[PDB]
Write a protein that holds these residues in place. Structure first.
Motif, PDB file in Angstrom:
ATOM      1  N   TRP A   1      -5.268 -31.994   2.152  1.00 17.64           N
ATOM      2  CA  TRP A   1      -5.863 -31.307   3.312  1.00 17.64           C
ATOM      3  C   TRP A   1      -6.907 -32.180   3.985  1.00 17.64           C
TER       4      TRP A   1
ATOM      5  N   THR B   1     -10.492 -27.708  12.956  1.00 14.81           N
ATOM      6  CA  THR B   1     -11.598 -27.235  12.085  1.00 14.81           C
ATOM      7  C   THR B   1     -12.715 -26.636  12.963  1.00 14.81           C
TER       8      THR B   1
ATOM      9  N   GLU C   1     -18.525 -26.499  11.513  1.00 15.99           N
ATOM     10  CA  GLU C   1     -18.267 -26.902  10.119  1.00 15.99           C
ATOM     11  C   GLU C   1     -17.928 -28.398  10.035  1.00 15.99           C
TER      12      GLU C   1
ATOM     13  N   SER D   1      -4.926 -22.052   1.374  1.00 17.78           N
ATOM     14  CA  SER D   1      -6.302 -21.622   1.027  1.00 17.78           C
ATOM     15  C   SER D   1      -6.547 -22.018  -0.416  1.00 17.78           C
TER      16      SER D   1
ATOM     17  N   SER E   1     -16.504 -24.598  -4.043  1.00 19.31           N
ATOM     18  CA  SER E   1     -16.180 -25.002  -2.657  1.00 19.31           C
ATOM     19  C   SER E   1     -14.783 -24.500  -2.287  1.00 19.31           C
TER      20      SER E   1
ATOM     21  N   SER F   1     -11.586 -24.311   1.188  1.00 16.03           N
ATOM     22  CA  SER F   1     -11.098 -24.634   2.531  1.00 16.03           C
ATOM     23  C   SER F   1      -9.766 -23.905   2.753  1.00 16.03           C
TER      24      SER F   1
ATOM     25  N   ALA G   1      -7.394 -28.196   8.100  1.00 16.88           N
ATOM     26  CA  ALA G   1      -8.399 -27.174   7.808  1.00 16.88           C
ATOM     27  C   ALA G   1      -8.821 -26.478   9.101  1.00 16.88           C
TER      28      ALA G   1
ATOM     29  N   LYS H   1     -11.108 -23.846   8.332  1.00 22.02           N
ATOM     30  CA  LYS H   1     -12.396 -23.483   7.735  1.00 22.02           C
ATOM     31  C   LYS H   1     -12.637 -24.376   6.522  1.00 22.02           C
ATOM     32  N   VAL H   2     -13.885 -24.827   6.364  1.00 25.79           N
ATOM     33  CA  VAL H   2     -14.330 -25.523   5.133  1.00 25.79           C
ATOM     34  C   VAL H   2     -15.671 -24.934   4.704  1.00 25.79           C
ATOM     35  N   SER H   3     -15.950 -24.941   3.409  1.00 25.68           N
ATOM     36  CA  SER H   3     -17.253 -24.408   2.912  1.00 25.68           C
ATOM     37  C   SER H   3     -18.338 -25.448   3.174  1.00 25.68           C
TER      38      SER H   3
ATOM     39  N   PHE I   1     -18.408 -29.168   1.883  1.00 30.19           N
ATOM     40  CA  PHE I   1     -17.541 -30.151   2.573  1.00 30.19           C
ATOM     41  C   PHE I   1     -18.224 -30.582   3.868  1.00 30.19           C
ATOM     42  N   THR I   2     -18.780 -29.664   4.652  1.00 31.12           N
ATOM     43  CA  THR I   2     -19.432 -29.974   5.934  1.00 31.12           C
ATOM     44  C   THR I   2     -20.580 -30.969   5.695  1.00 31.12           C
TER      45      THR I   2
END
Length: 330
Positions: free
Chosen positions: A42, A48, A52, A76, A83, A85, A109, A111-113, A116-117
């Motif tokens: 990913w 994204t 994020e 997902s 963590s 994504s 992605a 969405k990432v938590s 990761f950002t």
């Protein structure tokens, strides 16, 4: 075919390793964390959530002449560190170190938590565990290694991680110049989707070797060595002033300490992790309390031979019809 790519620590503590990966046509190069503990490839992407993304290189499928939406597929994932994504999926051409796979699932992605950002140096993950763990729904997808395997000269890849230095991932061949002595092979269980194996025991510094079976996974995507509480207490008991801190979240030791080595067994062979490898530095900037590289696996539900252990060895991930792991000193 074969491929060979250099892997580089992301920071001065070897918290993770990044490897350049070419995606699409013309190539978009992203720096991915090769993870033998998971099975999704990913990336940060043009899809994204903008809030994020903070410095990562993104994959833009609309700029790749070979990208195709894998219609209806989603993914997902949640990792052991909390963590996560998720997003949708494209197929595209992916190349690692000169080895090309066409039609690879590239999980874009949406969405990432936060972790990761906050890590601007990691543009995504390239999973190298068994494809039975891949999270794409409703049609599970194959890893880069599984897609490459039939084309490889030998159905293997090798991890040769550096201590505070670059290392190498090779696909399809075993570099006999990269290790000393012989490779000791050991059986793998694929029942949980991991490169799961049984170490034959351990020693702390110059102490006697304890023969004891320790089931665990070879996980390039985990920084530290996580072992049973008995083993970890035995190690830190040899460091004056070391303690387990609930506030910090593991064993800490005085930054003035000299750490002992840690030896783990692979059949009748022995891999020695030098003490310096176990030093993860101050818990906060300027602190005289340092974080240990060997931690308890209690509560995680599996032992993990992460980078602290693997970077002491040349490691063979043998994906023949009966998979095995190989370890050599180097």
């Amino acid at each position: 075919s074969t491929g060979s790519a250099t892997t580089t620590p992301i920071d001065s503590l070897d918290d993770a390793y990044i490897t350049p990966v070419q995606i699409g046509t013309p190539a978009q190069t992203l720096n991915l964390d090769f993870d033998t503990g998971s099975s999704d490839l990913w990336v940060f992407s043009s899809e994204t959530t903008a809030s994020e993304v903070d410095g990562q290189t993104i994959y833009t499928p609309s700029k790749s002449t070979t990208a195709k939406l894998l219609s209806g597929a989603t993914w997902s994932i949640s990792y052991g560190d909390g963590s996560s994504s998720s997003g949708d999926v494209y197929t595209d051409t992916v190349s690692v170190g000169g080895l090309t796979v066409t039609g690879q699932a590239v999980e874009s992605a949406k969405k990432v938590s936060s972790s990761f950002t906050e890590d601007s140096t990691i543009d995504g993950l390239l999973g190298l565990a068994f494809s039975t763990l891949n999270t794409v729904s409703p049609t599970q997808q194959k890893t880069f290694f599984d897609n490459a395997k039939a084309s490889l000269d030998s159905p293997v890849f090798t991890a040769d991680l550096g201590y505070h230095a670059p290392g190498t991932y090779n696909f399809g061949f075993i570099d006999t110049t990269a290790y000393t002595g012989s490779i000791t092979y050991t059986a793998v269980s694929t029942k949980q989707g991991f490169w799961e194996w049984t170490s034959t025991g351990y020693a702390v510094g110059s102490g006697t070797f304890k023969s004891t079976s320790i089931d665990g996974i070879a996980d390039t995507g985990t920084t530290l060595l996580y072992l049973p509480a008995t083993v970890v207490s035995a190690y830190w008991a040899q460091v004056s002033g070391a303690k387990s801190s609930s506030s910090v979240g593991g064993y800490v030791f005085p930054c003035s300490a000299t750490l002992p080595s840690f030896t783990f067994g692979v059949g009748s062979a022995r891999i020695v992790i030098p003490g310096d490898y176990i030093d993860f530095g101050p818990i906060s900037t300027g602190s005289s309390s340092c974080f240990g590289g060997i931690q308890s696996s209690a509560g995680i539900g599996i032992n993990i031979f992460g980078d602290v252990a693997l970077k002491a060895a040349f490691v063979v991930f043998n994906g023949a019809t009966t998979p095995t792991l190989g370890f050599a000193s180097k």
